[PDB]
Structure 1
């Protein structure tokens, strides 16, 4: 019987399974990285570092919490991020709804913190 051939076939099987695993790991890491980038870098208010609460979008296309941008605007009428003079504000149902859905998949600590801020800021639109 070819004992050497049995070992070589088991070794290739193992090598194949390892590369499959390493690929799946890189794919997993890439997706999570991208998800976290969205959470941390797109959906967090630059003024308060929280996920937007009652998101408002300015004429310059940047978004902020309603509470945050109003406090800012009492002192300065330039977008915090791009410094263009602020000419319009609008609330964004889609951003609020997207954020609620995303946050719903996070830890109950994160979820409860968000609830506390919402009530603390009297953020009515998030019923």
Structure 2
């Protein structure tokens, strides 16, 4: 009713934020709706322009590319 400690108006200043950890802000953003902060980006040795999320292709769409022997 007329009680409660938490539960007040919260400014929407924030606009974007990492997707992996989602701390508060995002260092960069991808054209596929995927952002990553310095922390994470740095963590992932292979920080190639390539997108990690998409790369996974988890229940995405029919796209044949091919494995990587290396």
For this structure pair, what is the TM-score category when the shorter chain's length is used for normalisation?
0.3 to 0.5
TM-score between both structures, scaled by the size of structure 2? 0.36
TM-score between both structures, scaled by the size of structure 1? 0.24
If you compute each CA radius of gyration, which structure gives the higher value, 1 or 2?
A: 1
Of structures 1 and 2, the one scoring higher in RCO (CA 8 A, sep 6+) is 1
Q: Which has the higher helix share?
A: 1
